[PDB]
């Protein structure tokens, strides 16, 4: 494990010469749009089987319950 060198020029500003928490709640609609658009497939795949399986189980249990109602 050894550090590799890269020719670069780095300009950095003091932490007390710039705003700290103002950049958090900035461009929030754009950030939310990126989160939604870049991850909608992943959210569908994560919550797809869960919701469909829950609905199927609920339907099966309801069908059995009314079937055994005498």
């Amino acid at each position: 494990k050894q550090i590799v060198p890269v020719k670069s020029v780095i300009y950095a500003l003091s932490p007390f010469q710039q705003k700290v928490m103002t950049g958090l709640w900035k461009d929030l609609p754009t950030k939310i749009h990126h989160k939604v658009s870049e991850n909608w497939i992943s959210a569908t795949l994560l919550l797809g089987p869960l919701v469909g399986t829950y609905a199927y189980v609920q339907n099966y249990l309801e069908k059995e319950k009314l079937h055994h109602r005498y």
Binding site: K1, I41, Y56
Partner: protein, 386 residues
Amino acid sequence: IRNQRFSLLKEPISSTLNQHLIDYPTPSNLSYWWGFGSLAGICLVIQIVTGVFLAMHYTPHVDLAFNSVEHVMRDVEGGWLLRYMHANGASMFFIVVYLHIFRGLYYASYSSPREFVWCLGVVIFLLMIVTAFTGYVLPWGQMSFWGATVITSLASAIPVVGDTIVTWLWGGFSVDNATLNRFFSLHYLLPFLLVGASLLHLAALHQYGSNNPLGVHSEMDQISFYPYFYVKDLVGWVAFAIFFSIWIFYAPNVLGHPDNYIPANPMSTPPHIVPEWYFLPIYAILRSIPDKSGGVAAIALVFICLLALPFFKSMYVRSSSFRPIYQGIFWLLLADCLLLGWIGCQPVEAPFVTIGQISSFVFFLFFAITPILGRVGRGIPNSYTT
């Protein structure tokens, strides 16, 4: 440079601590998902301290275990806080370990260099499972006693020595005082073995370096660990503290089972014997295929697959951020694991057993599809080359 003394961190008394906790170079682009290892270490330390302070008021006897627990709750000043911290922190320790494991699965933090890190993590997972099981048996509640009985009855699955092994582990012909004392001693012993395993885990990772969300070779842009990743870890610790206080002071027994507050009655049995919520995926894998030796073999196969995950080859692209198919497979795996855990807390009726059978198949299909995808995608650059 060594002629006269310099910064005391570089001195031999603090040299190793400095090199491994302050000046250790880590990638600068690590997300908040990398604080879960330190958070799990904090949870383990919390469990050790809280258990050490609970063992001063706990008597491992069948006629005194539940009464001692209630004495801790009521008579001991702050004992209710102590036991709630212990139980809910075991729950959060398993939560953060699950997040740790799944983040590693997503970012392929195991593939070529951290195979030993992943193997040590699997050993740590086994140790945590055993320790949590024995600790849950310790209060000697109805659910604790019957879960201990059932899970030890799984040991009667080896065709030759299963009965001998289960009888020797029970300390007799049934779960009784001998089993309680045995489990108390083991539950005290294992967390220190867990500490040793965690130290080996950290050292093995520090041999090569932490993976990054990009999965790329990260040595050109690295920063010292202390000034930049202690504050991020502090943010993670404070958020976890808020979550932990929420689950202790307002919903203490939500994660627990109500039947554990009934004194253990060997004659009677609860209508539904279910382990703790964090053993539910393993229990569902057990009960998916109908058998006992088959279920034990399935659990062993699960652990063998976890151990053999890092040893697959041709996984040149590490991070799942640059693998759409693998990202979809991982998200399907996470959904499958959640569904399996939910199934583990359900009866053995027809839809539940069918879904459990399907879920385990998907779980192993993840461990096959990953090598298949790696081998298929090894030839990506020649095909998309422009």
